[PDB]
Amino acid sequence: AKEIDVSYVKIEEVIGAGEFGEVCRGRLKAPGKKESCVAIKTLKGGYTERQRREFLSEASIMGQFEHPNIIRLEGVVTNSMPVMILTEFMENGALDSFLRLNDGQFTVIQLVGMLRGIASGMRYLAEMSYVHRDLAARNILVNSNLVCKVSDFGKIPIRWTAPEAIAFRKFTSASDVWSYGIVMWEVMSFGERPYWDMSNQDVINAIEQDYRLPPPPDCPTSLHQLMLDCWQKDRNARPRFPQIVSALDKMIRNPASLKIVA
């Protein structure tokens, strides 16, 4: 399962913290192949065997996929210690903090391009019969060219979760579509927190009582309408991911249509 020799890996710098330990930037150089940059997740410090399997489960799931908007697995280090998962390196990190750092600094067309890449990744996952269950801007990673990629493949996130998934634990691609509408709102608000200071139960009650998040400042009305479509209470009325990609493609082709704002 893409086991890799430790001698091919060089850790360069600690760049983050994950669920099981540190996240590093490094270099991967294998015989016959050019050197490449990688993100490296390590598991160390006296962990349980169940934690080890949970850590590696992410690599097992990620390695099933191949798509330009899904984080690519380079391989794993399991025959030695520390245990490692190596993925493609994403120079701009998580999308929510990246947009907060750059508030107001990208154009509508750039933001729509980011959303189109996320929707293409989700279109692929839904076609593979994979339900993500935690689609949120904090789980989207951004490269140097602003390409956005779905991550996090290995405590219900209430404000991202469709009401039938909260109430009945029925998670489907249609519940991921609800989450995608929340992501659209996060992107067009440059990384604001969904529902601001409302509590989890306040959010559940408001949604059941027909409240929906309003258009972010300067947000094209056509983008907010697509959000409202993703947030229909009846899961069977929501658009499917192929339809979402098509709608965003039309906006990119007809940028004049993004001029109407509330």
**Residue 259 known to bind ligand:** no
Residue with tokens 């990629």: 149
Question: Which residue among 134, 202, 229, 249 is the active-site one?
Answer: 134
How were these coordinates obtained? X-ray
- Does residue 134 have an active-site annotation? yes
What residues does each domain of the chain span? 1-89, 90-258
Which CATH number is correct for 1-89, 3.40.50.300, 3.40.50.2020, 3.30.200.20, 2.40.10.220? Answer: 3.30.200.20
Euclidean distance between CA atoms 37 and 32, whole angstroms: 16
Distant-in-sequence, close-in-space partners of 122: CB < 8 Å, separation ≥ 6: 132, 135, 150, 173, 176, 180, 241, 244
Helices of type H across 78-172: 95-101, 108-127, 163-168
Distant-in-sequence, close-in-space partners of 172: CB < 8 Å, separation ≥ 6: 131, 165, 235
**Residue 20 known to bind ligand:** yes
**Residue 26 known to bind ligand:** no
Resolution to one decimal, Å: 1.3
CATH architecture, domain defined by 90-258: Orthogonal Bundle (1.10)
Tokens representing 86? 């190596």
**Residue 41 known to bind ligand:** yes
- Determine contact, residues 40/85, Cβ cutoff 8 Å: yes
